[PDB]
Design an enzyme around this catalytic site. Sequence first.
Site, PDB file in Angstrom:
ATOM      1  CB  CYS A 128       5.616  -6.776 -20.873  1.00 43.93           C
ATOM      2  SG  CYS A 128       4.707  -6.452 -19.375  1.00 43.93           S
ATOM      3  CG  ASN A 174      -0.969   1.623  -5.041  1.00 41.06           C
ATOM      4  OD1 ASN A 174      -0.911   1.444  -6.250  1.00 41.06           O
ATOM      5  ND2 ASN A 174      -2.070   2.069  -4.438  1.00 41.06           N
ATOM      6  NE  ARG A 175      -2.124   5.682  -1.113  1.00 48.14           N
ATOM      7  CZ  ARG A 175      -3.188   6.420  -1.414  1.00 48.14           C
ATOM      8  NH1 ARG A 175      -3.049   7.682  -1.800  1.00 48.14           N
ATOM      9  NH2 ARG A 175      -4.401   5.891  -1.326  1.00 48.14           N
ATOM     10  CG  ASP A 180      -7.880  -3.550 -17.490  1.00 50.51           C
ATOM     11  OD1 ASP A 180      -6.983  -4.293 -17.015  1.00 50.51           O
ATOM     12  OD2 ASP A 180      -8.942  -3.316 -16.886  1.00 50.51           O
ATOM     13  N   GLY A 202       7.938   0.044 -15.685  1.00 53.51           N
ATOM     14  CA  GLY A 202       7.883   0.644 -14.352  1.00 53.51           C
ATOM     15  C   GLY A 202       8.728   1.902 -14.363  1.00 53.51           C
ATOM     16  CG  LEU A 220      -2.437  -0.540   0.980  1.00 54.39           C
ATOM     17  CD1 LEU A 220      -2.628  -1.588  -0.111  1.00 54.39           C
ATOM     18  CD2 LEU A 220      -3.039  -1.034   2.314  1.00 54.39           C
TER      19      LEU A 220
END
Lengths: 379, 379
Positions: free
Chosen positions: B143, B43-44, B203, B299, B40
């Site tokens: 990917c 994620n930020r 998506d 990323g 969590l």
Amino acid sequence: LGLSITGLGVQYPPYSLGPDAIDILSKRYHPESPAMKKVLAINRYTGIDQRSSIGNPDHPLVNKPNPPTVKELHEVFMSDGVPLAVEASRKAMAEARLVPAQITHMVSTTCTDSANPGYDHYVAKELGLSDRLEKVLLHGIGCSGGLAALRTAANLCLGHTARGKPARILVLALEVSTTMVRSELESIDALQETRIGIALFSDCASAVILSNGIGEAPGKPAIYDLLGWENRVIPDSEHDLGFDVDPMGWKVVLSPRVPVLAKASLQPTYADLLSSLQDQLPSSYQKPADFDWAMHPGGATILSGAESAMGLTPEHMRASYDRYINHGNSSSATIFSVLNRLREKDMDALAPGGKVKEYVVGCAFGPGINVEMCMLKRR
Amino acid sequence: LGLSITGLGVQYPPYSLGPDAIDILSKRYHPESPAMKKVLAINRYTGIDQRSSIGNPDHPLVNKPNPPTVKELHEVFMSDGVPLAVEASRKAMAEARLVPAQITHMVSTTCTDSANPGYDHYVAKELGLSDRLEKVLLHGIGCSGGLAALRTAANLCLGHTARGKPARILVLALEVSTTMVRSELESIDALQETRIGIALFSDCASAVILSNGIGEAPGKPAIYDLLGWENRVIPDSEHDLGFDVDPMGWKVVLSPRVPVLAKASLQPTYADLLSSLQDQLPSSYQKPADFDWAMHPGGATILSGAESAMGLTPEHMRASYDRYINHGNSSSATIFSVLNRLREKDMDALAPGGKVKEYVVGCAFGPGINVEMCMLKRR
Ligand SMILES: CCCCCCCCCCCCCCCCCCCC(=O)O
């Protein structure tokens, strides 16, 4: 075209199972029911004597309280399936007298695995192929995969031809279907539908090398020359044939319509195949019975259907009957197993008219419904 | 080679998810834990502001007592993903000024579905493509799939060139990853491992038309010409990156090594690309900073790694940052989205030193680890 199959290799697994293998597992995990009775009966009406499997009814994977999960299936695909693909590929390469460094592409297929990296990666790694290898792993096509991979390889070969480059392509099919026995059993028991998948399918790996001729020291031997191909989809037939992803693996869809639709597609596809290249063929190769036929043995009615539509004897498809009876339907891997068998001395003995044919029509059907056909010249 | 990209089309789903979306779901279905807390936090700090999704956190698929099964995931891939692919294809075809009968091949990829017939069959049927269409559905590559599919289409185009035939190939990528959110949440909670995939993936569907020029008007327009390509596998790195099939979909595999390996691969792959075409490029196009870079934004550290390895500014990869910040990582569909965005007037105004480049390097990495690179000339 300059396209030729210079090597073929086939590797079946160690076990050969009679129809009672299904009865054993059914009895062990399910009480008798009407739908199970029907399917167990059908299992004995196929005309398949023995089927190839990576294991027997006592294998731990299929003897859990539940069917194995798709993850558990993948694990065995890799430990027991991959080794067969490497051996089939080695055999094909040995026959073609190619060293690893000479393979320029790899076109592989399977419908009984999902993985990233795909299984072709691990095969290429064990074979010691180039870090520059161009690979294609086909998905979505089931039983037509062997011929679809061959056709795909043909196009890729011709791409290198257009650039003046040698192309030597490893074309590989690997299927491990027998591990899904508990999944099919669970569906038959719970849904009470007559699912005939457990009765038909087996395990196998097969490989051919396809070459574009460029770079070969001249007068080099080949097994078959690839002269042409045709492919079609039969309209509004998606619901008739399929293999749907599931937490238990993949679930077979296979309707009674399939062999009816396949038979109707044979004559017009053959016509188109023959018309595209008839001027390359001698006077003794004009009508369907003049050729030898490498049919994918999808089921008994595919073979009898083809005999009926094209006016053939069983001996015209002798290698197809041989693989079907003795090994069962190994999906995409079966067609190369058939072409390998066809060129053996004891199949020669059974040639119609006592004449081993110089030209061979290959044919397969799969989910779509997709139809694949090819014309080979046997050296 | 006569190869060009004549049309591009991109279709994201309507919904955009901010970093709170993962918080909402985790709190709803899992207790507080150290591993969940770490993920969590991470994620930020991804560099992603919004992720494109077929739905929001209240979608019924991801709000059942348990994570959806791979079967339930397929149903939604078909209902919600396939329409994106049809629209992306329509748009590519529209720009190319082609009608369905002119498409000779289809080369598609996804790593977020398994089906037979594959999803490409249903897309082609919706578009009204030919019953004779030659299709390739790639698997096993994740990917890197967009560029692998482009490269494969390139060889297929050339196959037709060898026979003097027109080729117009629809090259399609479709990924729906957001639906696996409960699967990854369950893994983080159960295994207590910091799994960062939940924070990155989104998506998308995207498509291009690749043409071999045969039967095109003399000096027929295109968006990009395809000049060359390179592909390599990084040895001994299968464990570093992957996507393993599972009853709950596919599970992400990702090691700490990935950014370093990806970054280190750039120099030699680029050197090989350029050596194979040294007298086709102007001398003003020699060093990496001379080109625009259409990099797959795997990323944040992939984009910054590339800047470091190759002496580039963030503006060299402006379209890559634009997709990444605003849409996230959409796996194989991202690269065509980047190539589509790059040619928009908005990206022109952000070019390094105000110089919009005439040559574009495309680059992507995926499970293998596979590296793909191509050289494009922008019209
Ligand atoms: C490993 C233990 C062996 C167990 C006994 C062996 C008998 C196994 C029965 C065979 C199960 C068939 C599962 C169906 C696979 C379908 C293949 C693809 C079909 C398609 O393309 O639609």
